[PDB]
Design a protein around this ligand. Structure first.
Ligand SMILES: Nc1nc2c([nH]c(=O)n2[C@H]2C[C@H](O)[C@@H](COP(=O)(O)OP(=O)(O)OP(=O)(O)O)O2)c(=O)[nH]1
Ligand SMILES: [Mg+2]
Ligand SMILES: [Mg+2]
Ligand SMILES: [Mg+2]
Length: 129
């Protein structure tokens, strides 16, 4: 079974909204809402990975961010370790840089059912802030 390390960014603005994209229909976890992010490559750190993935996917450089949660989740065909970084300062304005849907969503209104099941404890913990 494939084992992957994934770094994602919880991009939170001053109005308690999170920048959320929707995964492509032919991707793993197709059509799900997601925090922007992706695989940590050989030779790069989890911190470097979340910067690179947010630059690629939504056009921002996260700065002065912190590890909100790290967890492991066994999907039917792969095992993933997810690094959830809380990103409250960044350079740029996030957008659908890869042509993917992206929009600001109120934290209180997030529905964990809309995201991959691995995100359930993170979404709950975020609403506790
Ligand atoms: N990006 C992201 N992925 C998540 C979340 N929750 C979750 O279980 N995943 C899973 C889905 C995928 O198995 C993996 C994310 O990898 P990815 O498809 O974003 O990888 P990538 O950006 O490097 O790949 P690509 O789009 O360049 O093809 O982690 C999340 O909140 N954000
Ligand atoms: Mg990516
Ligand atoms: Mg990605
Ligand atoms: Mg990638």
């Amino acid at each position: 079974m494939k084992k992957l390390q994934i770094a994602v960014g919880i991009i939170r603005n001053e109005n308690n909204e999170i920048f959320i994209t929707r995964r492509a229909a032919d991707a793993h976890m197709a059509n799900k809402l997601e925090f922007p992010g992706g695989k940590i490559e050989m030779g790069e750190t989890p911190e470097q990975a979340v910067v690179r993935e947010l630059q690629e996917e939504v056009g921002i450089t996260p700065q002065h961010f912190s590890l909100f949660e790290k967890l492991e989740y066994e999907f039917p065909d792969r095992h993933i370790t997810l690094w959830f970084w809380l990103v409250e300062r960044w350079e740029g304005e996030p957008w659908g840089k890869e042509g993917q849907p992206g929009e600001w969503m109120s934290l209180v209104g997030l529905n964990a059912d809309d995201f991959p099941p691995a995100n359930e404890p993170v979404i709950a913990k975020l609403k506790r802030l």
